[PDB]
Structure of Xylanase inhibitor TL-XI:
Amino acid sequence: APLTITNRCHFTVWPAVALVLAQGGGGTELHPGASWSLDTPVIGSQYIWGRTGCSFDRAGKGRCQTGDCGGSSLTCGGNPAVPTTMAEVSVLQGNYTYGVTSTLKGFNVPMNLKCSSGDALPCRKAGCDVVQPYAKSCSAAGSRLQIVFCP
Ligand code: NA
């Protein structure tokens, strides 16, 4: 509420959110079963992807096994390492559109993008998007976006 990223894999994933035109981004560590509640901007679009096999020290430098974006400092920008599953979310004041690919940058983690007002958009193996825009629209006053890993 309003954006939620959930990890349904049996392994830890490291979600990363970066806006399309910005040098860097943010994220968290998600243990199996854990979710990340996020607040959404009035405007703009964001890339959302998961990273696996991240090992960091107390500072901490380190790299992720898949979907690594400049290590700890999530600067790329918007270009994590192949392979990685790429989810895109655009926002208008209130309205959401959500799209995903597993062809452009490969496939690492299966995804499911869904809205409480919209229809489900699955991406469970590589090649889920036949052609872009592989996206659905969501349009409510109090709607709720969900990204699931390993749905
Ligand atoms: Na990080």
Observations:
- The two ends are 19 Å apart (CA to CA).
